[PDB]
């Protein structure tokens, strides 16, 4: 693989660039939070007498 790309620097660049703009695009859509969901879910039953 290394020898392949040593003679094909442009092809090496293409992979790196495609990867980069895929990440740029990802950054626009990705949600933002402090944490992901970490609390366990709860269900509550409420009744009145």
């Amino acid at each position: 693989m290394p020898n392949f790309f040593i003679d094909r620097p442009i092809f090496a660049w293409v992979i790196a660039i495609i990867i980069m703009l895929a990440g740029g695009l990802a950054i626009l859509k990705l949600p933002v939070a402090q944490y992901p969901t970490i609390a366990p879910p709860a269900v509550t039953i409420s009744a009145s007498y």
Binding site: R8, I10, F11, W13, V14, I17, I18, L21, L25
Partner: protein, 177 residues
């Protein structure tokens, strides 16, 4: 929408860029990809003519057929310049010499595909009955695009290439090894 709209330019811009990048890797060149990308207009013009002349509209069906038309004319252009480029590189053949030997070797396979596909979509363009609205829309775009792209590309591609080869090289244009 609303919710917002018009995402077309962004996604086709990036589409355009990725295509150029893939072509750069394919040819190990930053400039040669243009001798392929330049053919995009050649199929679009025909798709636009047929649609307009037929009272059709720019819709989903028109968009997808066009991509298909662009795809194929891209594919034809890529194989042409791939043949020209190799002859020069592998063999010694000089610019013109190879551009002409390539385009000549490429003419037949190109015509086989174009006419097979143009004839293929004829049923759609001719469609009447259930869903003929969609069928007509798909067929006439592709038929128009394929025709112009086919006739225009076989002449414009060899051009694109030599103009691009000359504008971005060093030596040279003479036979060699």
């Amino acid at each position: 929408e609303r919710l917002s709209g018009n995402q077309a330019p962004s996604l086709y811009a990036i589409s355009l860029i990725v295509v150029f990048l893939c072509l750069a890797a394919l040819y190990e060149s930053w400039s040669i990809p243009f001798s392929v990308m330049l053919v995009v207009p050649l199929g679009v013009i025909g798709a636009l003519l047929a649609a307009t002349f037929r009272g059709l509209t720019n819709d989903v069906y028109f968009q997808v057929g066009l991509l298909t038309t662009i795809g194929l004319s891209a594919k034809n252009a890529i194989l042409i310049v791939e043949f020209a480029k190799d002859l020069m590189d592998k063999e010694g053949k000089g610019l013109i010499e190879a551009t002409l030997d390539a385009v000549r070797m490429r003419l037949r396979p190109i015509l086989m595909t174009s006419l097979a596909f143009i004839l293929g979509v004829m049923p759609l363009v001719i469609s009447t009955g259930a869903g003929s609205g969609a069928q007509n829309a798909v067929g006439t775009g592709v038929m128009g695009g394929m025709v112009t792209a086919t006739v225009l590309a076989i002449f414009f591609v060899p051009v694109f290439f030599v103009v691009v080869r000359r504008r971005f090289s060093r030596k040279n244009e003479d036979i060699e090894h």
